[model samples]
Target: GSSGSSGGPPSRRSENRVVVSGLPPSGSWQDLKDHMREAGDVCYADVYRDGTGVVEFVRKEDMTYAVRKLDNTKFRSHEGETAYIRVKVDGPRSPSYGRSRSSGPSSG
Candidate 1:
């Protein structure tokens, strides 16, 4: 893990990567990798305790797709705890944009 890593409140800090917040504190990077691998061509996921996480995709398009889909989706950890998930696409100007990123539904 990087020095001075803050896993909590990943919103302001984590920009390029889709930062999944409110995950199980007991959650490990491996667990996250397994869960998101089901997310359409995801290469892997890196989860940092205290709250930082990063998910690598096979393609940027896949990354965008996963980001849009994941933010609205719900997930359960290996420990059976409900997790707060989001795609974490940075640079926005609207709140409703956070609700559903694309209406045309281009998840590619």
Candidate 2:
């Protein structure tokens, strides 16, 4: 057997995304991003109407760190109200899951 041909593909399973819950309704994307930055570099951030948010970090390590440090942490809303927020690592979303597309019919 040859002794110079034993290289395999590098593992690319890195989770660099985080889901944030319990955010104040009035919270903005900037607020969430700013808060999460304390844990590491934030690449992107968005907030939803249901007091939930999503954040992306520059590195998987950052995402994991954020989840540990930010979970159940107090956050200040725009109205000066403080509330506890939940942070967790976000998994990859499937193409057909949680997608709302209307390519079949259009209403006039």
Candidate 3:
């Protein structure tokens, strides 16, 4: 006879997330992921329109190591543009309070 087994609980918060800044305009999400993969296994990676990037590693150690290894490092784009990017661990979010709201009438 066999018995049923259970797995561990899901991880709600991810501490291995990192934020990357100073990305070149020509950099895409795939580029960001490939660049970050040099450090470790990239669980998720994204490059926003504002030249900012986000990367999540599968292991926390990889995230910490990546911060020291990649911070202030040079990043090159397909357009021949180069930038000194900044990498840092993404900290926990604070309560969404005291945010200013714009209450202006507008029409599309």
Best candidate per TM-score, number?
A: 3
Ranking by lDDT: 3, 2, 1
Model 2: per-residue Cα lDDT at residue 67: 86
Estimate the lDDT of model 3.
0.80
Candidate 1: which stretches are off by over 4 Å?
1-16, 90-108
**Which of the predicted structures, 1 or 2, would earn the higher TM-score when compared with the native?**
2
List the pairs of residues colliding in candidate 2. Answer: none
Winning model by lDDT:
3
Model 2: runs farther than 4 Å from truth?
1-14, 92-108
- State TM-scores per candidate: 0.57, 0.68, 0.69
Worst 10 residues of 1 by lDDT: 91-100
Candidate 3 lands at a TM-score of 0.69
Per-residue lDDT for 48-98 in model 2, tens only?
999999898998788888889888999887678787899887653443333
Candidate 2's displacement at residue 83, Å, is: 1.1
Could you give the C-alpha RMSD of every candidate to the true structure, in order shown?
Answer: 12.0, 14.5, 13.4
lDDT of 1 by residue, 24-55 (tens): 67777777766666656666567776655677
Give the C-alpha lDDT of model 2. 0.79
